[PDB]
């Protein structure tokens, strides 16, 4: 149950999730794997900024779909 995380600069990882995962948790799964601080992470799907207190189901995040990332005070 995996999705792609992508920024605007050639960087993309694959991240293991569940549709029941909250957004602040995927942001934790990224800090776990790559070390970025989640209070600074911004996630975007279908052009909407992902509210922390919601789930991938709530945004209809499908599998092998791409989530966009930027980081506050770095690139957004």
């Amino acid at each position: 149950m995996q999705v792609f995380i992508k920024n605007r600069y050639g960087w993309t990882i694959t991240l293991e999730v569940s549709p029941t995962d909250t957004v602040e948790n995927v942001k934790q799964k990224i800090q776990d794997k790559e070390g970025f601080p989640p209070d600074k992470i911004r996630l975007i799907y279908g052009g909407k900024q992902m509210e922390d207190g919601r789930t991938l189901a709530d945004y209809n995040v499908q599998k092998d779909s791409t989530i966009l990332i930027c980081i506050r005070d770095v690139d957004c």
């Binding site: 920024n7 600069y9 960087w11 790559e34 070390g35 970025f36 601080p37 770095v74």
Partner: peptide, 19 residues
């Protein structure tokens, strides 16, 4: 320097911008 603070390390910053 702010970027490195946000990213934790220089090495991550370099990976993220891929440069």
């Amino acid at each position: 320097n702010n970027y490195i603070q946000a990213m934790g390390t220089r090495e991550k910053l370099e990976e993220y911008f891929n440069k």
